[PDB]
Design a protein around this ligand. Sequence first.
Ligand SMILES: *CCC(=O)N[C@H]1CCOC[C@H]1Nc1ncc2cc(-c3c(Cl)c(OC)cc(OC)c3Cl)ccc2n1
Length: 268
Amino acid sequence: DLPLDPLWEFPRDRLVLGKPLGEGQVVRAEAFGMDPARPDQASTVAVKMLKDNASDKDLADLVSEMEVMKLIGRHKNIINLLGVCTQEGPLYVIVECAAKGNLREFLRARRPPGSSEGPLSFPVLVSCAYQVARGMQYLESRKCIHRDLAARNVLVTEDNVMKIADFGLPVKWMAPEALFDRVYTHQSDVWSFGILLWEIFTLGGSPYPGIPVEELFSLLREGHRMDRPPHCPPELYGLMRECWHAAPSQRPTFKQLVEALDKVLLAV
Ligand SMILES: *CCC(=O)N[C@H]1CCOC[C@H]1Nc1ncc2cc(-c3c(Cl)c(OC)cc(OC)c3Cl)ccc2n1
């Protein structure tokens, strides 16, 4: 028995559920009048709900995620909360559905064969990174630490807009202070962003490729980092490397990443 939030409650009978998207449940669905300024207009959305096997605590976690998404509020470059169903029936949390899946798969699927030019230009790739940096700057301004930023946790819209996912609630993405000291800050997220930038300019590459998940720590400690990937401009590699300074205070801020990437896009 949960409160009725008049800012968020959406009628349970305007929500037509569809095929599962992922188990543990999340279900795609048609929503009628998610935009109250076109209230017969239908839209595809994603709906999180509990599986019948779920404890007192599993309900608490879905409640807190719904509550944190309300508090963080709306931005173009995150998965936005759209509505909830809390009354006389199971708890539904309704959010944006992105047609083209996660950014890792978007890029892999758009690999050209061998040495040929692929549909993803330098500016589109820099734009991807720009949009992720703007999303993270927003989440940081609302006191949200992601803790797991990676191309698999960014989703892509029908219009190729980047949307950070799973910010409500992977050693090769983690800052040294997060690996050894279990310390997560905004600057930890900046390390991860560096890794995500590498992923973008390798079109969805597996970071530290070859290198076993047990040799990494020693390579980082000795001051080793991934090499510049083929065809990546030095300006972009230098941003990755700045992200991978050992000292968190020497990494750029998301604000500075937004400015640097902005400068590159203006220069096209
Ligand atoms: C929209 C059509 C469709 O079915 N798209 C699929 C394409 C391939 O990838 C899976 C589907 N897309 C998609 N889009 C958005 C999703 C959002 C969530 C999600 C997130 Cl990211 C979230 O972040 C805080 C919170 C919640 O619920 C509280 C949810 Cl449901 C999950 C899956 C998504 N899949």
